């Protein structure tokens, strides 16, 4: 799945073709400035080893004067001036490469991007509903984001540092074939192994900063499956079984971790064994070869140093064709996308143009299926008309055929065979655009834009003026709320906003289609849920908009039936029953059944918490001083090895000495590897247990707390699963990490520049000088080499949440035919950061430049100045390439080290934030074994005056002073209206909360001295949604009674109680049938049933009922009333209700109000003195 | 194979200068340097003077110090010395030896040349 | 300067046996190192002074092995064992350890012994 090479770069211009063709030559002129650099170290080399022979023979010619040791050194010193003048060259000749080789590769690969992100959203918004049906919206949504994402790392600057990575390899092994050959092909022969182990150092590399949620993804879902409901577990005691849940994968995802980082380490320190032991075996024999007189010092410094980063160069050039060999695949989702052409096309404008349209109309034998549901046809042959103004509606069967023809009017579909023709004209001749302007439609469940009132209205046309705004919401019958808002049209509205109602919207939604001025206008279902005293209005304003325009309206309230034209009735897709109102009633068919049944960082406290793994700390720093500290020692070594050369010895002192060095080079190799690998595993082990044990400490004393904590929204679901996937892993990174950065950079140039002050100072002074910006040049470096493009794509968050608003509700933008709109608002909110990124990249390159350049000029000035300081003999010249050693390529190993390590202030704030969840304790301590623990079984709750405001606001008194007594064995109910809060002593009973003034006497006992843990073994809860778990139904049943020895016994009895044990016996692996998204999935009945089950498994003495409506199997009633009527006999229940199926077996029914009882009494009692139930009874009863 | 060998002999009248010249031939070049003596008719060989056959940095015994100048041409691979100031004297046989020098001085010279003669005549 | 006296002027060697030469110096040529270098070169009539032993014990590569030297101080000896008639030159024996006079010695040709 993957497209060609000349396929990804056909959304360039010729500007970018030009950019791109410059910016390879730049890289591969950047790529041989190293080797030419090594040639020229090799030639002054050679220029400083010639004369330092010379100096001794001269020395012992005693009468000799200080002009004669003048004129050899004299020679050496004008010389060099020249080779200075080479450096400056190629420093001066690499700062314009690199930053030809930069910014002409981010500029030509952000400008195509650019280009393919706004024609890939104008691709998506000119597509099929048919299509759109198909495809998921959030696949597709990270499709956009990440796949976009992908493309411009592929191509932005991976292949200019590929160039160059190869440019650089093709260099170094021509100098090493041009200057000498023999010593080329003896490393040549171990090139192989040493650029497979740079190939895989260079993956490990790129892949660095890799957070790697496939580990703790197991727990990740536990996580975000507990703490997404909370009021269960705390309410059935839920504790051990969860945290030895998390406990387990915790503990894979903790040795997964360990293997990822000893195979890491021993991958970064197989790297450093081969750079010694090659250095060891290539000077053994190039002091072979030179003490036998055939090549010079200078050329086996150069075909070493150059052939040597030849190798690694093509082991870097590997995961810069892995880029771009995963975005050729993606490439093909987004383009086979923008490639499709929709049959439709409902941007083209090619149709005609009918005016003084009226809306006759003629359906003519349409055969229609749905091509997603494709095997099922639910309309065929149908056959209706209209004339002008005729408000026709329809009633029949649920859901087939009452949304298939008011979507087929705005050709959302083709029909598959039949011509629907409006006017005596074709539907599919017109264009498309002017056919959707001419039909407004009201959705059923309206959705609103998170912007202003006023722009929401602009939504109906862009042309419309205020005036006709205002005349339009006063003319829809919306001006009486809207009246009343805070200042003007700019409010804002939205689930961010103002959360309004649903008729509210809904007429507002009606008044766009107004301002729409439609001519064939069409209702499906503008009462759905709607309450009575709103249906009315609207119902009202809707019979304002009938008059004048060819009306379908297909809704619920069955009286305004009366009052329409003509009707008709759905037969299995054909409708048949055509007629008028009592014409309908005469035909008795299926409207006589419908009349017949409805009518602070703190460092040494991160390290505190580390308390525990002192004996793999100790060992840690031990070994990361050793392995941070030869550097210094291969400092000396090669100062050493090169220095036995400018110095006149016999031929088998020089021998010896030769191999004496390059024996303690492999020795090194060795030495370095080992604590490597120590370094890596021992911090590696004590970097994990701190994650594990920390991630457990903070899932216990997260779970522990009260549930106030839980309401303010700084404390989600998502912010907590944040918090406890992120964090651990956070917190790892600023214990042991930075101990071992502080010491191996203490030691690294601690030990370099104490030495290099002991042999020569006057460089080291110069050196000092220059050392932070070759150091930041190191930094900035390995900032390139992985971390650069992650930063920039967290920015753009502008246009995307435009293009994820607009993709959801794409029915209602399809209606409206307003993409236009949301594809400038996507234009100019990508139009600023492209306008950023380009100034980033200019900022980039120069900088990446600048630090090259001063990395080349070090090299220039320190050996000029050496070669001064040399020529008074004040210091050799292996005391200057010994200093020179030291205090650069330290400077360059501090760079990279303090680098490759994660950051701090991210690590710090991450532990001051888990430091201060960790550490708090509520009131009501979940843990508390404190208490009475009575032997209590009768259960007389007694409230008296409990008056409650919840802490999330504090602006509404909700309870004032409620006195409620309840009788023991007896179903005593409570019922309400809206924004009463039915279920807050329900809440309250489990101490949910605590209320400011007044008690709960639990037989003469406040709740707030009682033992929490006794009362939820004696409580049992039913709520309205159940919450399931992905374990077996088994213990999803068994979850009623937690800190028990519950067997298979009970679970069959529960299951006896249920009537859903022959539908368990129904089911293939009885009680192992798992639940969930790897499951199956239940009606509302059904899981209503498991919540009843789970919750009688306790066998309590006191129960807790709290239903909510809206189901829609509505036979499961019946049933689910005998269960609660097998509970409603020796257990006291508390019952709030919305269905009042339930009103006269409940005992003791209570209508409440401003915190109050209005008045005790039974069903009769309380309907015969004609208050509220009054009221609810004589709405349910018309 | 390593082998330096020379020019031809001299017949050269008094006053003039002689260019004699040691093509050195089998071997790097740029390294060794280039040792110039001189033997009498029946006696001692004396020796002249060195260059350091990568930059020309010469040196000379105290006695020919002016009347001889060495030159190098690291193209062609030889070594000249243009001997001016000529005396019945200098009428000897002349050779040429090379050194290495990374380890000079303590490495005896390993390759002569043939050495030909210059006849100073009046 | 080492005022070098090789003090044979002449060999007169038969054809089949050993010979013996004298290196007889001036001043010690015992260097810092613990090494004495003085060499020994055999010049042919009319080509060029080759090289036979240097470093005084040790041996030339490529020269045969009938060849000796000895001694050590101020006394120095090449020992040839059964001479042939391809050996018939002039021997003389570099170095001066203190240079740069880097004196050289006299010479010794060798005979036929009628």
């Known amino acids: 799945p993957a497209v060609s090479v000349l396929t990804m770069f056909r959304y360039a211009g010729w500007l970018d073709r030009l950019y791109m063709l410059v910016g390879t030559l730049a890289a591969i002129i950047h790529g041989v400035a190293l080797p030419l650099m090594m040639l020229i170290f090799g030639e002054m080399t050679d220029i400083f080893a010639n004369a330092g022979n010379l100096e001794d023979l001269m020395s012992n010619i005693t009468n000799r004067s200080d002009i004669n040791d003048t004129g050899f050194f004299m020679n050496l010193e004008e010389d060099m001036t020249t080779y200075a003048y080479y450096y400056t060259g190629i420093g001066a000749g690499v700062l314009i490469v690199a930053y030809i080789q930069v910014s002409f590769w981010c500029l030509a690969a952000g400008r195509q991007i650019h280009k393919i992100r706004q024609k890939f959203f104008h691709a998506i918004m000119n597509q099929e509903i048919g299509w759109f049906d198909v495809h998921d919206v959030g696949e597709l949504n990270t499709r956009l984001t990440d796949d976009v994402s992908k493309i411009n790392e592929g191509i932005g600057d991976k292949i200019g540092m590929f160039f160059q990575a190869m440019a650089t390899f093709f260099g170094g092994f021509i100098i090493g074939f041009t200057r000498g050959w023999k010593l080329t092909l003896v490393i040549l022969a171990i090139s192989p192994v040493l650029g497979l182990s740079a190939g895989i150092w260079a993956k490990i590399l790129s892949s660095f900063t890799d957070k790697e949620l496939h580990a703790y993804a197991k727990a990740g879902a536990v996580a975000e499956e507990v703490l997404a409901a909370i009021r269960t577990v705390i309410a059935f005691g839920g504790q051990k079984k969860e945290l030895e849940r998390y406990n387990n994968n915790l503990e894979e995802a903790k040795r997964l971790g360990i293997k990822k980082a000893i195979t890491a380490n021993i991958s970064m320190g197989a790297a450093f064994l081969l750079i010694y032991a090659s250095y060891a075996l290539a000077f053994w024999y190039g002091t072979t070869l030179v003490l036998s007189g055939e090549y010079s010092i200078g050329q086996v410094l150069t075909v070493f140093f150059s052939v040597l980063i030849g190798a690694f160069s093509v082991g870097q050039a590997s995961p810069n064709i892995e880029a771009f060999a995963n975005a050729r695949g993606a490439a093909y989702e987004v383009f086979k996308i923008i490639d499709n052409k929709p049959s439709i096309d409902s941007f083209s404008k090619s149709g005609h143009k009918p005016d003084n349209i009226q809306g006759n109309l003629e359906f003519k034998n349409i055969h229609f299926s749905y091509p997603s549901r494709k095997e099922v046809q639910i309309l065929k042959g149908l056959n209706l008309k209209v004339k002008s103004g005729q408000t026709v509606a329809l009633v029949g069967n649920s859901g087939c055929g009452k949304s298939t023809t008011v979507q087929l009017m705005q050709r959302l579909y083709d029909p598959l065979d039949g011509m629907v023709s409006i006017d005596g004209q074709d539907i599919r001749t017109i264009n498309v655009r002017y056919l959707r302007e001419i039909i407004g439609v009201v959705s059923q469940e309206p959705v609103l834009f998170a912007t202003t009132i006023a722009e929401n209205i602009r939504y109906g046309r862009e042309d419309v003026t205020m005036d006709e705004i205002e005349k339009a919401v006063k003319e829809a019958n919306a001006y009486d709320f809207i009246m009343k808002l805070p200042h003007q049209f700019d409010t804002l509205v939205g689930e961010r906003g103002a959360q309004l109602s649903g008729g509210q919207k809904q007429r507002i939604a009606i008044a766009r289609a107004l301002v729409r001025n439609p001519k064939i206008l069409l209702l499906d279902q503008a009462t759905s849920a709607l309450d009575t005293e709103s249906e009315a209005v609207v119902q009202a304003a809707l019979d304002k908009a009938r008059e004048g325009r060819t009306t379908i309206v297909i809704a619920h309230r069955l009286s305004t039936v009366r009052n329409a034209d003509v009707i008709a009735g759905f037969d299995g897709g054909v409708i048949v029953e055509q007629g008028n109102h009592d014409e309908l009633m005469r035909e008795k068919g299926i409207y006589f059944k419908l009349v017949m049944t409805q009518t602070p960082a703190s460092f040494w406290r991160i390290l505190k918490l580390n308390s525990t793994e002192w004996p793999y700390f100790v060992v840690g720093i031990f070994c990361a001083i050793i392995n941070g500290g030869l550097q210094p020692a291969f400092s000396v070594i090669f100062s050493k090895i090169i220095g036995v050369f400018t110095r006149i010895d016999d031929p088998e002192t020089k021998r010896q000495n030769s191999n004496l060095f390059s024996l303690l080079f492999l020795i090194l190799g060795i030495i370095s590897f080992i604590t490597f690998f120590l370094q890596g595993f021992t911090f590696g082990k004590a970097g994990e247990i701190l994650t594990k044990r920390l991630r457990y400490m903070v899932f216990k004393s997260m779970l522990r707390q009260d549930v106030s904590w839980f309401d303010d929204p700084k404390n989600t679901t998502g912010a907590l699963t944040t918090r406890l996937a992120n964090d651990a892993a956070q917190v790892k990174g600023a214990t042991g990490s930075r101990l071992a950065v502080i010491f191996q950079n203490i030691a690294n140039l601690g030990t370099g520049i104490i030495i290099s002050f002991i042999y020569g100072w006057q460089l080291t002074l110069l050196l000092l000088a220059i050392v932070p910006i070759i150091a930041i040049a190191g930094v900035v470096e390995m900032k390139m080499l992985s971390g650069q493009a992650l930063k920039d794509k967290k920015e753009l968050e502008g246009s995307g949440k435009i293009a994820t608003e607009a993709i959801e509700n794409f029915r209602t933008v399809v209606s409206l035919t307003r993409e236009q709109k949301f594809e400038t608002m996507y234009a100019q909110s990508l139009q600023i950061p492209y306008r950023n990124a380009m100034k980033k990249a200019h900022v980039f390159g120069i900088t990446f430049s600048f630090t090259q350049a001063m990395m080349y000029f070090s090299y220039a000035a320190c050996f000029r100045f050496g070669a001064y300081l040399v020529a008074h003999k004040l210091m050799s010249f292996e005391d200057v390439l010994l200093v020179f050693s030291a205090i650069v390529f330290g400077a360059m190993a501090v760079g990279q080290v303090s680098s490759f390590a994660p950051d701090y202030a991210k690590a710090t704030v991450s532990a001051s934030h888990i430091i201060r969840i960790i550490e708090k304790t509520p009131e009501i301590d979940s843990y508390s074994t404190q208490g009475l623990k009575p032997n209590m079984l009768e259960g007389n709750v007694q409230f008296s005056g409990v008056v409650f405001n919840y802490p999330t606001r504090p602006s509404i008194p909700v309870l004032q002073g409620l006195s409620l007594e309840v009788k023991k064995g007896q179903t005593l109910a409570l019922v309400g209206s809206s924004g009463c809060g039915k279920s807050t002593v329900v809440q309250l009973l489990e101490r949910f909360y605590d209320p400011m003034a007044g008690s709960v006497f639990l037989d003469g006992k406040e709740i707030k001295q009682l033992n929490v843990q006794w009362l939820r073994a004696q409580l049992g809860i039913v709520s309205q949604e159940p919450i399931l778990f992905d374990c077996s139904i088994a213990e999803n049943i068994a979850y009623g009674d937690n800190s028990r020895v519950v067997s298979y016994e009970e679970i069959v009895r529960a299951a006896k109680e249920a009537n859903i044990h022959q539908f368990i016996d129904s089911l293939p692996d009885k009680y192992n049938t798992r639940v969930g998204d790897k499951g199956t999935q239940l009606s509302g009945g059904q899981k209503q049933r498991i919540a009843i089950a789970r919750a009688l498994v306790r066998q309590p003495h006191i129960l807790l009922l709290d239903q909510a409506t809206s189901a829609l199997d509505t036979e499961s009633e019946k049933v689910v009333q005998e269960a609660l009527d097998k509970a409603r006999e020796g257990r006291t229940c508390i019952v709030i209700a919305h269905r009042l199926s339930t009103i006269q077996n409940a005992d003791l029914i209570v209508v409440i109000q401003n915190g109050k009882v209005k008045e005790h009494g039974t069903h009769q009692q309380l309907l015969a003195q004609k208050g509220i139930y009054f009221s609810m009874v004589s709405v349910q009863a018309g | 194979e390593v082998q330096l060998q020379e020019s031809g002999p001299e017949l050269v009248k008094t006053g003039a200068s002689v260019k004699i010249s040691c093509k050195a031939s089998?071997?790097?070049?740029?390294?060794?340097?280039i040792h110039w003596v001189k033997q009498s008719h029946g006696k001692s060989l004396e020796w002249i003077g060195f260059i350091s056959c990568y930059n020309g940095a010469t040196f000379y015994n105290q006695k020919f110090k002016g009347k001889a100048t060495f030159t190098v041409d690291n193209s062609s691979s030889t070594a000249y010395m243009k001997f001016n100031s000529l005396t019945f004297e200098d009428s000897a046989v002349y050779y040429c030896a090379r050194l290495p020098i990374q380890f000079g001085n303590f490495y005896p010279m390993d390759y002569w040349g043939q050495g030909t003669t210059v006849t100073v005549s009046s | 300067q080492v005022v070098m006296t090789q003090s044979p002027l002449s060999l007169p060697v038969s054809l089949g046996d050993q010979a013996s030469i004298s290196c007889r110096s001036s001043?010690?040529?015992?260097?810092?190192?613990?090494?004495?270098?003085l060499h020994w070169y055999l010049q042919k009539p009319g080509q060029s002074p080759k090289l036979l032993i240097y470093?005084?014990?040790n041996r030339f590569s490529g020269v045969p092995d009938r060849f000796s030297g000895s001694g050590s101080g101020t006394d120095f000896t090449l020992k040839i064992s059964r001479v042939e008639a391809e050996d018939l030159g002039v021997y003389f024996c570099?170095?001066?350890?203190?240079?740069?006079?880097?004196?050289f010695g006299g010479g010794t040709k060798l005979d036929i012994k009628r």
């Open positions: 089998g071997y790097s070049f740029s390294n060794y340097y």
């Open positions: 570099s170095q001066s350890t203190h240079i740069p006079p880097w004196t």
């Open positions: 001043q010690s040529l015992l260097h810092s190192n613990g090494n004495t270098y």
């Open positions: 470093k005084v014990s």
